[PDB]
Amino acid sequence: MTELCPVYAPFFGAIGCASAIIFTSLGAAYGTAKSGVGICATCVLRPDLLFKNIVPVIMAGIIAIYGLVVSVLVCYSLGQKQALYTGFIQLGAGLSVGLSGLAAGFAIGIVGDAGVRGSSQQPRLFVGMILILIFAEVLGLYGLIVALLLNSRATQDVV
């Protein structure tokens, strides 16, 4: 075990990879759950805009895709001889994307619930719902940007 490449270096990279999907999956789960509760609860009175209001769950699926892509790439970054430093940045990227996705998922859930409640009652609120969901999504998008930039930085000039 090299002094700069200890045998326990894979812990941090592996846990980062795990968290990168775990936390975003929890966030997307909460977002989908709250959004769909609102959907089915408020479109029952007036159904025809079910397909229109499906959107927050699409956003949560985008969050899940975000977690999937960051996790698969940090997996691609994993190895056996990797330096402790590499494991540290893989862990950092994983936590960044996962927790940013969790925050984004909370935003998706709450906003989607309120938005579908309004939209079933009044139609022009749908566009504003779209805009807010976009913002709650760009939160997790920023998290993804941070994570991908990190796990790109996690490999060069490594001994």
Partner: protein
């Protein structure tokens, strides 16, 4: 000995297997429980489309198969005789955490939304298309974690 294969690596391999199975089982169980609550709630009122509304329980089962497949692969590539490597140990650890927590979260989401959708399905007939759309868009949540588990595991073996 091989320093990259300390003797406590199988502990983390079994960590991955155990966590994967227990969290997948827990998520599938919550999904099944909440979906069954919804099914029994609407049964006493409009007993008919119960079979059509059964599907979320089928998805909870599908979560169970996800957990099963990941766990059985993790078990398959463990043995005392082979020089199990510590990197592979944390690797199976992470595989298990990914799949288990993804299944747990997807089970929570699918159980809650299936319950609410099936309860409101008795009132409005055509809500089933939205219910099943949410069903599959929560299915993908656990599918993503299972794919993570597969690739992380196959690199663990490699």
């Amino acid at each position: 000995s091989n320093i990259y294969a300390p003797l406590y690596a199988p502990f983390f391999g079994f960590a991955g297997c155990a966590a994967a199975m227990v969290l997948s089982c827990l998520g599938a169980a919550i999904g099944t429980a909440k979906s069954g609550i919804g099914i029994a709630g609407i049964g006493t009122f409009k007993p008919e489309l119960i079979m059509k509304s059964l599907i979320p329980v089928v998805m909870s089962g599908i979560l169970a198969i996800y957990g099963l497949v990941v766990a059985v692969l993790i078990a398959g590539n463990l043995s005392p005789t082979e020089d199990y490597t510590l990197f592979n140990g944390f690797m199976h650890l992470s595989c298990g955490l990914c799949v288990g927590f993804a299944c747990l979260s997807s089970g929570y989401a699918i159980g809650m939304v299936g319950d609410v959708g099936v309860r409101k399905y008795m009132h409005q007939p055509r809500l089933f298309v939205g219910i099943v759309l949410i069903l599959i868009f929560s299915e993908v949540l656990g599918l993503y974690g299972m794919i993570v588990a597969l690739i992380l595991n196959t690199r663990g073996s490699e």
